[model samples]
Target: MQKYVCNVCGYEYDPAEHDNVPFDQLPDDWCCPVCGVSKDQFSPA
Candidate 1:
């Protein structure tokens, strides 16, 4: 499983417990729940 972290607010998205959705598959409009940053702002953690 891969994990992604939001660069803006440090929010982490772990795929293991989530719906198993790939990070890259998420919509471009997806925003960090903590800071409202776009998905492109996330990076592998």
Candidate 2:
């Protein structure tokens, strides 16, 4: 499974709750659910 972390606040995603989004559904608008940070503030962790 892939891991995600918030760049702005160092918040890690809970795999149990945050399921991976489909490739087609993913876009330039995805944000951290807790911090509402943009994709620019996130990266694979």
Candidate 3:
């Protein structure tokens, strides 16, 4: 149940709300809704 935060826009991605999908399991093409940064720009918060 780890949480991930977007470094570019400070968007928090909680595993509990996303069908249990882990941050590492997110698609490579995933982008932040706030800043439009790619998954690579996110880190564990």
Candidate 4:
């Protein structure tokens, strides 16, 4: 599983737990669930 961290709110997105859509497959408009930051604000954790 791959994990990503939101640079704005420190929210961690774990694909192992979230099965519907992986981060890599998410739409370009997808933002951080916690902080509402743009997808570009996240990075590998």
Q: What's the true lDDT of residue 38 in model 2? A: 79
User: Using alpha carbons, what is the TM-score of model 2?
Assistant: 0.52
lDDT at position 26, candidate 4: 78
Which rank order by TM-score, best down to worst?
A: 3, 1, 4, 2
> Worst ten-residue run, lDDT, model 1?
15-24
TM-score for candidate 4: 0.82
Alpha-carbon deviation at 1 in model 1, angstroms:
1.6
**Candidate 4 residue lDDT tens string, 1-45:** 668899988998888778846788878998898889988999989
List, residue by residue over 1-45, the lDDT tens digit for candidate 2: 566678788887645555565322457787777778876786778
Please, what is the whole-model Cα lDDT of each candidate in the order they appear?
Answer: 0.87, 0.67, 0.91, 0.86
Model 3 agreement with the true structure over 4-39: per-residue lDDT tens digits: 999878999999989999989988898998999999
- Per-model C-alpha RMSD: 1.0, 3.0, 0.8, 1.4
Provide backbone clash counts, one per model: 0, 0, 0, 0
Candidate 1 lDDT tens digits, 1-45: 789999989999887656988888777798899999898899999
lDDT of 2 at 22: 38
Winner by TM-score between candidate 3 and candidate 2: 3
Q: Candidate 4: list runs displaced more than 4 Å.
A: none
RMSD to native, candidate 1:
1.0
Arrange candidates, best lDDT first: 3, 1, 4, 2
TM-score of candidate 1 against the unseen true structure: 0.85
